[PDB]
Design an enzyme around this catalytic site. Sequence first.
Site, PDB file in Angstrom:
ATOM      1  N   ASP A  35       0.803   5.103   4.375  1.00 43.92           N
ATOM      2  CA  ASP A  35      -0.460   5.123   3.471  1.00 43.92           C
ATOM      3  C   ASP A  35      -1.127   3.592   3.644  1.00 43.92           C
ATOM      4  O   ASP A  35      -0.609   2.720   4.390  1.00 43.92           O
ATOM      5  CB  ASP A  35      -0.023   5.413   2.035  1.00 43.92           C
ATOM      6  CG  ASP A  35       1.206   4.472   1.560  1.00 43.92           C
ATOM      7  OD1 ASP A  35       1.303   3.515   2.016  1.00 43.92           O
ATOM      8  OD2 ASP A  35       1.650   4.954   0.621  1.00 43.92           O
TER       9      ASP A  35
HETATM   10  O1  LIG Z   1      -3.102   2.168   0.436  1.00 43.27           O
HETATM   11  P1  LIG Z   1      -3.688   3.360   0.246  1.00 43.27           P
HETATM   12  O2  LIG Z   1      -3.410   4.447   0.881  1.00 43.27           O
HETATM   13  O3  LIG Z   1      -4.866   3.162  -0.840  1.00 43.27           O
HETATM   14  O4  LIG Z   1      -2.545   3.672  -0.893  1.00 43.27           O
HETATM   15  C1  LIG Z   1      -2.556   3.575  -2.162  1.00 43.27           C
HETATM   16  C2  LIG Z   1      -1.382   4.178  -3.086  1.00 43.27           C
HETATM   17  C3  LIG Z   1      -1.072   5.564  -2.353  1.00 43.27           C
HETATM   18  C4  LIG Z   1      -0.145   3.031  -2.930  1.00 43.27           C
HETATM   19  C5  LIG Z   1      -1.427   4.185  -4.430  1.00 43.27           C
HETATM   20  O5  LIG Z   1      -2.027   2.829  -4.949  1.00 43.27           O
HETATM   21  C6  LIG Z   1      -0.404   4.732  -5.181  1.00 43.27           C
HETATM   22  O6  LIG Z   1       0.468   5.387  -4.832  1.00 43.27           O
HETATM   23  N1  LIG Z   1      -0.291   3.988  -6.284  1.00 43.27           N
HETATM   24  C7  LIG Z   1       0.669   4.349  -7.423  1.00 43.27           C
HETATM   25  C8  LIG Z   1       1.447   3.189  -7.043  1.00 43.27           C
HETATM   26  C9  LIG Z   1       1.899   2.615  -8.576  1.00 43.27           C
HETATM   27  O7  LIG Z   1       1.114   2.371  -9.490  1.00 43.27           O
HETATM   28  N2  LIG Z   1       3.271   2.265  -8.809  1.00 43.27           N
HETATM   29  C10 LIG Z   1       3.767   1.856  -9.777  1.00 43.27           C
HETATM   30  C11 LIG Z   1       5.307   1.761  -9.804  1.00 43.27           C
HETATM   31  S1  LIG Z   1       5.998   1.029 -11.281  1.00 43.27           S
HETATM   32  C12 LIG Z   1       6.076  -0.469 -10.709  1.00 43.27           C
HETATM   33  O8  LIG Z   1       5.523  -0.824  -9.710  1.00 43.27           O
HETATM   34  C13 LIG Z   1       7.083  -1.540 -11.466  1.00 43.27           C
HETATM   35  C14 LIG Z   1       6.302  -2.008 -12.781  1.00 43.27           C
HETATM   36  C15 LIG Z   1       5.255  -2.970 -12.459  1.00 43.27           C
HETATM   37  C16 LIG Z   1       5.899  -4.325 -12.944  1.00 43.27           C
HETATM   38  C17 LIG Z   1       5.449  -4.973 -14.029  1.00 43.27           C
HETATM   39  C18 LIG Z   1       5.568  -6.562 -13.910  1.00 43.27           C
HETATM   40  O9  LIG Z   1       5.999  -7.224 -14.404  1.00 43.27           O
HETATM   41  O10 LIG Z   1       4.795  -6.866 -12.818  1.00 43.27           O
HETATM   42  C19 LIG Z   1       5.366  -8.071 -11.990  1.00 43.27           C
END
Ligand SMILES: *OP(=O)(O)OCC(C)(C)[C@H](O)C(=O)NCCC(=O)NCCSC(=O)CCCCCC(=O)OC
Lengths: 75, 255
Positions: A35
Amino acid sequence: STIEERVKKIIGEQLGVKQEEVTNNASFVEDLGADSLDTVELVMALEEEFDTEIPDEEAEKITTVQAAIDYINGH
Amino acid sequence: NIWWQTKGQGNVHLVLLHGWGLNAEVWRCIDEELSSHFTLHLVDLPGFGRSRGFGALSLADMAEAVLQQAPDKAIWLGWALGGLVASQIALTHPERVQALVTVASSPCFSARDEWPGIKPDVLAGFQQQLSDDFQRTVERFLALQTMGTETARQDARALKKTVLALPMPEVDVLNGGLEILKTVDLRQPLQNVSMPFLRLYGYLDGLVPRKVVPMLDKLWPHSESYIFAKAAHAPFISHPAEFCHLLVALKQRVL
Ligand SMILES: *OP(=O)(O)OCC(C)(C)[C@H](O)C(=O)NCCC(=O)NCCSC(=O)CCCCCC(=O)OC
């Protein structure tokens, strides 16, 4: 340890493919399931391994293994 | 114990709290500039960076631990998860906080009804890959933070360097941080914060959907918000000069 092998090692490590199985024609997205996140990681890893900087314009073109080999070699 | 560093010449004190998975070294892109206008207090959150004495904590316990050697009075700036910690402190000890600043942070990180946020199954999937292939996951997380911006790759590089600067946190600490993000919801209690309250966001931030900004403007009519048009999750990395400019202006409103 040639350019091809190094490029394939990076692709294989990045996407999770065993690198003996990686084809020169492999499409990162279509074939390998990459992706937009995977492709960013992929380009960053190429720059690292080869100690170069790839402008967003070349990067955008590198959609297959062969394209990666091509760019890296001519530099 | 908790790792603290004080630096700078400024007359106003400013505590900087980092986000999940990182440490106080993430601030090095702006700390020289900020240190010329503030006295900076940089912290490794409990369990993170060089603050090793700790396992998983509740938001409440994390905040109290951090408060222990904090300055008497200061502006509190929290980035992402640090934003919750800043917010928690503003709520429970408003007298220690001259102003609350959150950056790329939400009062309720997970999506709810009519409430944009991270989808619970997304978060659970993440917490999982973390338990599985920990790096490829921490490293994808760093790219996630800078995606879609003109400086995506060098900013991810700068974040990776922070991570490399110090040994990674234990998986139970990482896990515990996700638990906080998963469960905490400060939307209602923050209506009551009386000190100046500045909220900064990245327009392109996938982790804190920009949509919450008008909703929070409404819910916290007494707060103020600014959006960085071309920033994602780390606007101080991608837009250091604009970021420092805003904080300097905030200083003047605190007098
Ligand atoms: O590149 P592309 O084809 O456009 O793909 C985009 C994808 C498919 C990656 C898309 O953005 C996606 O799948 N998004 C969902 C990803 C997401 O939002 N994940 C959240 C996971 S939870 C996490 O990441 C930890 C929490 C955040 C930390 C909070 C903090 O204190 O920050 C440092």
